[PDB]
Design a protein that fits this description.
Three copies of one chain form a homotrimer. Chain A is of the alpha/beta class and 462 residues long. Helix content of chain A is 20%, strand content 31%. Chains in contact: A-B, A-C, B-C. The PDB classes it as transferase.
């Protein structure tokens, strides 16, 4: 029986943001959402998020997150940010007075923490019969962390905050993860003895460690060797670094599973993205939101895809796209823009300097050059000539061949197997197998250049 | 006198690929091709590649590689992957029974190994009169490697595989390179004593070390300080990391030789690419295949070039191109697509949102905006107006000026110094110095907007 | 009272460049300009730059740099590169014979050196009453540096150059920064005792250390813990690495100040660039020259901006731009090219495959597709249809709607609230609220396809 508290009621002033700290994203989820996803998988009996000033904005998200995860998450309010010890007290209030289970506390800014590390904590806690067990780690750069103070016999004495530490303390590299397990009575008891006479004038949760030692209670430090699993984010430097570490882990799982990633340093893949066996990812690529790539694809350099479904054997090169689907063996790019609701059939082609929006394009149909396709539906095995525009609903059939420089003025229907000559403004329906035209005939004006640009380099008409 | 065996008969199941392990690429060559290029430069008397299941696909490449290198490379078959000891035995069979030379063995997955490290091996082997000499190195992360076991007096006792190692072994950081020299008789003798009673039930080549020690033969470990020269690739994580290390070495040689590379981390250069003095490479660039860049070029950000010749003093910015040539002082980009067979003359310009395919464009001719050029030949000092299309063979002469929105309907010839008015569909030949037109005249319809869009913001025609 | 010498008279042959070493750039300034900016902020009484062969090119820049900084910088000439000791002697000559102040010497190739490190030097020098104080640091890779030789009692004895060092020396990791403070008389005295009998046959400034020790003068080494502040650049490998370190520091200051940078490794920001609170920078971005971004912007992936002003709340995605301004809440990109003199009003849009040059575009006006805008002025709340061209001065008013495929043949004026039909060549002025047209009417040719492409897939007109 376990209750988990997530402290998320801090101001987050070190982020320098009008967006609440806990809502800043990495790999496609807010920090808060990474933290709640980890804990949901542990399924504690109770789950409590402490909110503060920003509560009106954060509480709804947490609401949505609880439906997604199919459990109840309670919200407890901390009206002023009096410190992490004060934040725990606020959390406990949403538990019954007689609650007997263990209490786990973690922060809203520790976004790589995972169900495993959580479960190892709880087991260690029950195993050693600890009143408090605290996760620790060691780091080349311990700045801004609580430091772990041990006695001569390796006993944990206390945790000392960065602001409160001696210059000699501070050199300590074993750090506080800010993830704890407590016996609830021991914990209620220690919180009442907290005073705020320290460098920041706050009620520090970390002071509970020395307080329980006073009472001769058992204090256990549980070292986590993978430091990143418990790294915190307090500013945008630490956010980006953890984003970068998380992204390497995600790239690696995909490589181990059969994806070639030429350049992981410049390949960003969100947490929910799937990729098929033997696809190749070239440098400078972001695969974002719920993007899915099938097998044996080529995802070319300099491509950004957000919520795009790409089938097997497709090629997607220097393309910027969202909410769109691209079929098996289709060719997209280079220099192509897909806007939401684009659906490209299997073996379709969207080519260089082509933009598509809210349009359906059938099997094997090609839109290869310099064209805009908006609010249109196109059949199968059709060819849309270069430098054309769908001027926004237009229906084009199958096996159609439209000529370069055609403007399709919505709404207009072009029948199966119809043609359009180069330079046509289509304003009326075109029967199947008709040719539609509008351009006047060529006239050559002889010796225009001698007459109207005399002495120019072009009077090499001589 | 030396025979070199390359073991390439493993399944490669850890790559998770339907492409044979040894064919996966880095910097423009398969691993197998990196390995054979290194060994060819050593010119041993005999060179033997052990192939397995995938033999029908690999043997032809090796054939092609032997012509390229002007030597014979034999292929020996290993029908089932019984282990690296079994693979050696298969290799030896393609040598005569009386062969007396030393035998060098290396893997198909050690792609940075070089002629030097090979030659230092052979010399050390002859110098210490060793029955076996094995290349070793030491690593922060030794996972998946054979570990070197030494006696109290620093003597090599044995090599222990990752799967077979004690937890205490495993902490060993001195690792087996899998590159060996052997006395042939000692080697034939040890292979016959191999048994497969180990964690993977395989005949391990590494067991030969302990076996020859048994017989009181001389065993020598030769430490290679540059770990990368002997790193192996077993999965796509290790492939990409070695690709990244190789690419730094290649970038550096070019910098030492007079190329500015603003951002080596995001500059990928293949092994055969050449670059001239004082050229500048901006971030996000791939230079691929047999690409050659002259001196004082600017190769702009976000450019990918595969088999492109670029002369001196040219500028190539945000361009995606292959099998094309670009002359001295030409300007290409940003946002330009070159398809195969594009040849741009000196001082030519291909501009933003321009695509060129199988076309020749003469000295100083400019195609600067929004245009498609396919299957055409263009003379010198010509100007192709914006938003034009070569609708696919068309010949345009020199000092020509074509107007915006011209469609050139192949096949058509435009004489020297000719002009085209804006909006012309060219279907017939244009004499030198003629002006060709087709567009009807402008008509203004007065107060159309009051009439046909009443109350719209545009009835600020008032 | 202090005189600062910057030695910049070396050939720089290791750069392999026809551009003088000291002019090579990082983050938007030459090395020489980084060095003089640091020293100006210290405001010594005298500031002397030693120039050599390349003097005619470098002296003017230094001239310009002295006006920018509002002080006088003298130039002293060193006619042949006899060594760094000889270079100091040349510098001293531009000081009066009776000069009594301390002399600071630093190199032209130490581009991260800062006013602070300089000031700590001078204070340490005055504090210990040193005849010479030398800045040192320690490094994993000391190659190519002078090594610091200390006695048994930790006393600095001498500095030994890379070329002159024993193999055992060379293993020394404490290195010479090449930044010194001297007592002037001690310094004049030591320089006269220098001889050039060493591996490079040069008069080495570093030899002054052992020489003053001989005379029992006080020699002090002042260790700089941040190694980068005193790293030198001798080749393009060392240039790019220091560029990369400098760029991380600059990215970090912006993150600490409230800018999200998703991927610092691939975000290049010049030293003078400013960025507002809560803007987001996506990967593959260069912000260059005097670029200014306001708050809450999105600066999308794959964007390069040089001297561009972007207001608050704007979006600038896959855009290549220079000398242009983009207003509050405007949308630019993806795949957009801004050329100099582009001014986009607030809430304006420039879209995919759009190029703009020397044009003014008013509040809320949209140019969203496939268009070229050159030498034109456009009013407010106007819409420029797709695939259009401004054929170069043209004036378009406000609330105008122009149709797809319109060519505007300069010079032409389009009145407020006017329209253009699809496919119009505008050669004459269009009154306010008129509709201008030129395209002929659509003709359908029935069963053209049966007749003129019999048996083709398009005769699915059946
Ligand atoms: C005193 C304390 O706890 N310090 C720990 C805290 O430092 P740190 O300085 O990181 O403390 P923070 O201010 O980030 O707060 C921790 C978490 O508690 C929340 N919060 C904070 C104050 C408050 O009044 N209410 C509230 O709900 C914050 O939103 C944050 O999610 O985390 C570090 C590791 O990540 C530890 O090494 C420190 O020992
Ligand atoms: C037992 C053995 O040799 N292990 C070595 C092997 O481990 P590793 O586990 O890398 O062994 P691999 O399976 O990669 O095989 C080595 C090479 O031999 C080939 N092959 C393998 C099995 C087979 O039946 N036939 C065959 O031809 C493979 O294609 C590969 O090219 O390389 C490592 C370094 O890179 C060493 O540290 C290990 O000590
Ligand atoms: C003998 C000497 O000084 N060596 C130092 C120099 O090595 P390093 O080998 O870097 O010496 P460089 O050749 O770069 O010269 C140093 C500076 O002095 C200038 N210059 C050089 C020669 C000359 O005749 N005239 C002249 O003006 C160069 O332009 C350069 O700006 O800098 C290193 C750190 O960066 C130090 O660790 C070395 O101890
Ligand atoms: Co924190
Ligand atoms: Co291997
Ligand atoms: Co037209
Ligand atoms: Co130097
Ligand atoms: Mg705080
Ligand atoms: Mg295996
Ligand atoms: Mg057109
Ligand atoms: Mg030199």
């Amino acid at each position: 029986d376990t209750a988990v508290l997530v402290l998320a009621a801090g101001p987050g002033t070190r982020m320098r943001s009008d967006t609440p700290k806990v809502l800043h994203t990495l790999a496609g989820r807010s920090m808060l959402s990474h933290v709640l996803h980890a804990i949901a998988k542990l399924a504690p009996q109770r789950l409590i998020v402490v909110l503060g000033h920003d509560h009106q904005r954060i509480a709804p998200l947490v609401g949505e997150l609880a439906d997604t995860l199919g459990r109840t998450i309670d919200v407890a309010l901390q009206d002023r940010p009096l410190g992490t010890g004060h934040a725990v007290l606020c959390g406990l209030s949403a538990l019954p007075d007689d609650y007997a289970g263990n209490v786990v506390v973690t922060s809203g800014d520790t976004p790589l923490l995972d169900a495993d590390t959580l479960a190892d904590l709880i087991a260690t806690h029950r195993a050693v019969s600890a009143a408090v067990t605290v996760l620790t780690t060691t780091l080349d750069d311990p700045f801004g962390y609580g430091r772990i103070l041990r006695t001569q016999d390796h006993e944990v004495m206390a945790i000392v905050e960065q602001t409160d530490a001696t210059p000699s303390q501070r050199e300590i590299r074993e750090v506080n993860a800010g993830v704890y397990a407590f016996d609830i009575a021991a914990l209620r008891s220690a919180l009442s003895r907290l005073s705020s006479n320290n460098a920041q004038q706050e009620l520090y949760l970390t002071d509970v460690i020395a307080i329980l030692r006073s009472d001769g209670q058992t204090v256990h430090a549980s070292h986590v060797d993978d430091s990143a699993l418990v790294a915190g984010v307090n500013n945008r430097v630490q956010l980006a670094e953890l984003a970068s570490e998380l992204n390497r882990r995600v790239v690696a799982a995909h490589q181990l599973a059969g994806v070639t990633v030429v350049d992981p340093a410049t390949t960003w893949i969100d947490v929910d993205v799937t990729i098929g066996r033997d696809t190749v990812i070239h440098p400078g690529t972001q695969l974002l939101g719920r993007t899915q790539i099938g097998g044996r694809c080529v995802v070319g350099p300099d491509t950004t895809l957000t919520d795009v479904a790409v089938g097997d054997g497709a090629s997607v090169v220097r393309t910027h796209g969202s909410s769109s689907s691209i079929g098996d063996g289709a060719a997209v790019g280079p220099f192509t823009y897909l806007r939401p609701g684009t659906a490209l059939g299997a073996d379709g082609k969207l080519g260089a300097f082509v933009e598509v929006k809210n349009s359906t394009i059938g099997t094997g149909t090609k839109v290869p050059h310099l064209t805009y396709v908006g609010d249109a539906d196109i059949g199968e095995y059709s060819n849309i000539g270069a430098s054309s525009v769908f001027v926004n609903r237009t229906t084009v059939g199958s096996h159609v061949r439209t000529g370069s420089d055609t403007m399709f003025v919505a709404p207009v229907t072009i029948g199966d197997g119809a043609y359009t000559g180069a330079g046509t403004v289509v304003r009326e329906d075109v029967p199947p197998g008709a040719l539609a035209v509008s351009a006047g005939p060529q006239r050559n004006i002889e010796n225009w250049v001698q007459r109207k640009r005399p002495g120019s380099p072009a009077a090499q008409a001589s």
